[PDB]
Design a protein around this ligand. Structure first.
Ligand SMILES: O=C(O)[C@@H](CO)OP(=O)(O)O
Ligand SMILES: [Mn+2]
Ligand SMILES: [Mn+2]
Length: 503
């Protein structure tokens, strides 16, 4: 068996400036020799090319999903944005049923969510689209329960989103703020139920302070030293008639982890965090499915990915190995397989333990040498068709925002890379050396401060096949089609990416 390997250098991208660029400052002779001998291009790993909004840096989860799927895998924000822009949203069955529920019970429509443009948990423009829909179907009025951010956005920005939303209410002729809670309260994820109860009591017009306007209560918080995230939940005077039997709730958050708890309070009949009298005939709609214990109608259902690279390999009777250290093991397993834990037939996996340190600058080599030795051990068995390998280090050490450790990390990876790839080449196989998004290409601001984040830069691709030229650009969703090309395996239609290899 001639092996073909995808070797993912996590958080390793192409950036022109050398300043604070560990990728360019590192001595990486093995990478450079392959780069100088073999065909090379660069592909996009951020924004719309990976199913994220324009301007948004790529990441490990999204990047490994796109890589394994061989297509653009649209994430929640973009999917909902596109649904709005193209009209589907306003036809959505769950949203129109929530409105039929209100109209048929003469009851009230409530809207919960994180009122910012952070884009991690929500996007407040989706609130405006719901208000437009409610107005269109004649709802009359809509109680909006605002959860303030200050964490995925500037710590004191709530007043701008509140102002703009107040103008929407006037413009569209519908809706009002009913309650206002910092996300510390409404969006806990550590089962601190006393924080949640305060949000719940405001939303319900039970126990809470009241202010005449959303602005007033936020400004009162500011004057006390409590910024957006920490606003103590409050009620907006005369604008909150409670959540009563017959009502409907739409929760526009799309990220499960911080929306689940509040949703359990309203809509898990088994909820025991604190004692409640649940609303009867409550229509409870969540933008996504937050967990299995919430009785909700799901506005945007999870889409399963058929014919990821691993499934195609299976269906061609090929064997495959997924391998990485702990820190990127879910990436090369679960995410690579399209969000599936189960092994395919023919699949085996190798987990190497990551060191137990708070920040990986303390051991820049991490477990890269043990990953390399496990891999050499597997390739010496001679029974692998496909290998999916990730070297975690450039991303994990780069997050430290420290240049010398990040350089050392890349240099350790380079030494391992040369042993892995030379072995693949002795076995008459092929490697694609690339990345899932950038990070280590920039670990310093232009003013020499630590920079601890991913980048939007395009990622390198080297394909260790002679006599071929690569296409000039492309995206992560093109990698799996390139592996299939190298394996001489037919690409199915639902893999819409294109081989980077020119024919
Ligand atoms: O709550 C979350 O999941 C987001 C914050 O927007 O990340 P973290 O909480 O870990 O900052
Ligand atoms: Mn990554
Ligand atoms: Mn990262």
């Amino acid at each position: 068996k001639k092996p073909t390997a995808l070797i993912i250098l996590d958080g390793f991208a192409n950036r022109e400036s050398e300043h604070g660029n560990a990728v360019k400052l590192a001595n990486k002779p093995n990478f450079d020799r392959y780069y100088n001998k073999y065909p090379t291009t660069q592909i996009e790993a951020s924004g719309l090319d990976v199913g994220l909004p324009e301007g948004q840096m790529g990441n490990s989860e999204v990047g490994h999903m796109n890589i394994g799927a061989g297509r653009i895998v649209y994430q929640s924000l973009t999917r909902i944005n596109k649904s709005i822009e193209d009209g589907d949203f306003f036809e959505n069955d769950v949203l129109n049923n929530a409105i039929a529920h209100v109209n048929s019970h003469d009851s009230a429509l409530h809207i919960f969510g994180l009122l910012s443009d952070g884009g991690v948990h929500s996007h407040y423009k989706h609130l405006f689209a719901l208000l437009e829909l409610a107005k269109k179907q004649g709802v009359e009025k809509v109680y909006v329960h605002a959860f303030l951010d200050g964490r995925d956005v500037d710590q004191k920005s709530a007043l701008k989103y509140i102002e703009e939303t107040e103008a929407k209410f006037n413009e569209l002729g519908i809706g009002q703020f009913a309650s206002v809670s910092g996300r510390y309260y409404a969006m806990d994820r550590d089962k601190r139920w006393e924080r949640e109860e305060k949000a719940y009591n405001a939303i319900r017009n039970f126990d809470a302070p009241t202010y005449a306007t959303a602005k007033e209560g936020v400004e009162a918080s500011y004057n006390e030293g409590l910024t957006d995230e920490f606003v103590v939940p409050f009620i907006v005077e005369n604008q909150n008639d409670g959540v009563n039997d017959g009502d409907a709730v739409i929760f526009y958050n799309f990220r499960p982890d911080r929306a689940a708890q509040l949703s359990e309070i309203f809509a898990n009949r088994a909820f025991e965090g604190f004692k409640v009298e649940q609303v009867k005939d409550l229509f409870y709609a969540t933008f996504t499915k937050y967990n299995d214990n919430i009785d909700a109608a799901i506005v945007f259902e999870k889409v399963d990915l058929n014919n990821t690279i691993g499934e195609i390999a299976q269906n061609n009777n090929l064997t495959q190995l997924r391998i990485a250290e702990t820190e990127k093991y879910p990436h090369v397993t679960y995410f690579m397989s399209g969000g599936r834990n189960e092994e395919f037939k023919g699949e085996r996996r190798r987990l190497i333990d990551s060191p137990k340190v708070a920040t990986y600058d303390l051991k820049p080599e991490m477990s890269a040498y043990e990953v390399k030795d496990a891999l050499l051990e597997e390739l010496n068995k001679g029974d692998l068709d496909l290998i999916i390998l990730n070297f975690a280090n450039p991303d994990m050490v780069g997050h430290s925002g420290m240049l010398e450790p990040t350089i050392k990390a890349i240099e350790a990876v380079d030494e391992c890379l040369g042993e892995v790839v030379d072995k693949i080449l002795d076995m008459d196989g092929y490697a694609i050396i690339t990345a899932d998004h950038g990070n280590s290409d920039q670990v310093l601001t232009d003013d020499d401060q630590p920079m601890t984040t991913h980048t939007t830069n395009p990622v390198p691709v080297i394909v260790t096949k002679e006599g071929v030229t690569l296409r000039e650009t492309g995206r992560l969703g093109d990698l799996a089609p390139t592996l299939l090309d190298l394996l001489n395996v037919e690409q199915p239609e639902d893999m819409t990416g294109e081989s980077l290899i020119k024919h």
